[PDB]
Amino acid sequence: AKRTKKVGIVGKYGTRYGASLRKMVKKIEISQHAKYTCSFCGKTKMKRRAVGIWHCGSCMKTVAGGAWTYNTTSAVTVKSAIRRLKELKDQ
């Protein structure tokens, strides 16, 4: 059965810290504790080890990613920009 109406993962914090702060930290905690699909082995075992470190259980590959998500939108745009600048630098 559904146990909470809206708090979800931040029900562990009780009534404390303020509704807006709990709402703010809810999405970060969800993405922090999510298990992502490893882009090397294909399994859904890539999970956070510490802040910025994402380790896959199966292939034992460790990646430097974001603090709460596996990669940041900033880093994705940066990688695309670097690829474009490389292909423009050479010919």
Partner: protein, 149 residues
């Protein structure tokens, strides 16, 4: 401990004697274990490679920038931060870059830097929510936290 950026342990070959040299690079986001990273003037633009700023294009962004031509990385080291290579002039061998503070700095074109943004993402987005979490944060850094007005 004490910093939010992950550190990359990278092993090189010693060019002059039979030995393996281990470095402690600051992990640019996107690098993984088992990846080859290339350091030098003739290195290619890839995330994690180290190469002088003067050889880099007019819009690239960099991770662990040197303040002086020859020391190790000094700028844009904290997690999620990066600098941008704005402009060059081959004469006087100078490169103008933009620092995380928004300031503009002229440095030597021989300064090396890591391509990409440093890992550790938007660490400051999450509210700490707890004096205990703040205590554990600063216990790994230094005695500064409980601040009396």
């Amino acid at each position: 401990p004490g910093r939010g950026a992950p550190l990359a342990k990278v092993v090189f070959r010693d060019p002059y004697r039979f030995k393996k040299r281990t470095e402690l690079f600051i992990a640019a986001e996107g690098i993984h274990t088992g990846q080859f990273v290339y350091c030098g003037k003739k290195a290619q633009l890839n995330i994690g490679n180290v190469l002088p700023v003067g050889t880099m294009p007019e819009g690239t962004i960099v991770c662990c920038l040197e303040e002086k031509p020859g020391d190790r990385g000094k700028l844009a080291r904290a997690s999620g931060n990066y600098a941008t290579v704005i402009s060059h002039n081959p004469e006087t061998k100078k490169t103008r870059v933009k620092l995380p503070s928004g300031s503009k700095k002229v440095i030597s074109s021989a300064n090396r830097a890591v391509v990409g943004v440093v890992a550790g993402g938007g660490r400051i987005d999450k509210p700490i929510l707890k004096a205990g979490r703040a205590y554990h944060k600063y216990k790994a850094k230094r005695n500064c936290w409980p601040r009396v007005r």
